């Protein structure tokens, strides 16, 4: 009858809901996607023994050229369950999956789940100040994008946070790290020129977050860029003027240099 | 003392991760606070019966002014669980309480939870357009904040959408409506003439989410500012040009009226 969106979590299996569990376990068919982010901390065993299921995981192409062939011949008979990592709706196009559903006649409950989104809190950073967020692409070709970068620069000048969400090639197990993510965006700078990300830039980086364990750091682009902030997933953050106490955060817990402090300067 | 902080969702006693649940059972001693925000859908004897250990509930003066006396000495050579609404550490209150902690060579670590930053995206409008977030307080004595509507107006300016917290009173449990927002709203507008919120501004109202069956209603403000949303607390969004795709999931699932097709996209 019905479809469930049931989010996973950041890191690993423990990270659903309970009450995202206790649908799971009790639907007839269970589907899942693992393109649209990477939990780090487990695998599809892990998850399957949890739920005491069978999973069967989708390809992008699956999802968004065949997802009501491959449910409705489902969801009109018995309840189905579609797992994502993180939350659902998040930083993904699974939104309009709901419409599809709903216009062939199933209705969809959603069941979320921690988001990178909203995890960036662990940063010390207000999460009121950010703005507008972004994802910096890996290039393809000739193809270049840059977006990103005047995503930045719009929050910036608004005294804004911008968080930036990066890219990821599941199907090539490519999750493009946060030095990656600098080295591109030195590399608009250097063509636009806008002064809106060089080596004195200040940035905030946020690695497997759910983990007991993530790593938080945050400095100026030309001491970070070559860091080793441990496996993906990650985040880049390029912070706005800062408050005090999100200064005193940094430098206490993301091991700042403590001259952020003066948010005067 | 290490502590673990360890959020417990959006709506329900079942909200909280499997990690954080299984956590908060080892630990020695589990307290909690409902002053940032309230869990709507459940009780803390519910909660309690849940975690299967005593809460100490603790208010708003005994964590920002005596945690460090009633939590430590307390739990000497344990482990702490301090449970909170939602994701912990996206209050303001939550990090300024750990880098405290860390001063006192107290380690902490989070347990993530869904939080209404990342749930809103269950109104389709797409993560990365929200741009600054703001909360709508009540006018008081001789004091009329309305920073708010600057912040609406900035984002809305930039076709970002806003996200709006509404007042909350949460010793004495009593919320700010959507519909009361909507009023302060237009009231502010009527001094400010800033054509940024009147009678013809779209707007999208969120109510219960963590709920399976959560109030999801798009509209223009004429029509929805005396319109029964359900019991508190209500989210209030003013969303900026929306998406095709946002639109039609707005249409479809919020039931917004066929107009915005054409007038808001
Ligand atoms: N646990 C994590 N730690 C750090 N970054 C993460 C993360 N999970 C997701 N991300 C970031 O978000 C990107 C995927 S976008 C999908 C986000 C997911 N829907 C959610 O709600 O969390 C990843 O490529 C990475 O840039
Ligand atoms: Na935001
Ligand atoms: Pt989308
Ligand atoms: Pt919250």
Redesign the interface.
Known sequence: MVLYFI?L??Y????????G??IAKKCDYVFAEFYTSLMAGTTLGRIQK?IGKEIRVLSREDVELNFENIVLPLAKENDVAFLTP??????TTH??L??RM??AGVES???????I???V??T?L??????????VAYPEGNWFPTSYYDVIK?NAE?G?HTLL?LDIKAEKRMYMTANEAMELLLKVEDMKKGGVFTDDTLVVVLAR??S??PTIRAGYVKDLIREDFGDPPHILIVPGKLHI?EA??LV??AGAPREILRVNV
Request: hydrophobic residues 40%; aromatic residues 10%; glycine residues 12%.
């Open positions: 989010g979590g950041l690993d299996e423990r990270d659903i809901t309970v009450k569990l206790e949890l993180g939350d659902p709706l998040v930083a939104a309009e709901r419409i709903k216009r409950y959603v069941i979320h789940a921690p988001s989104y909203s995890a809190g662990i010390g207000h999460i009121y100040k950010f703005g507008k967020s972004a994802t719009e608004r804004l969400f977050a759910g007991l364990n106490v005193e955060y206490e817990i």
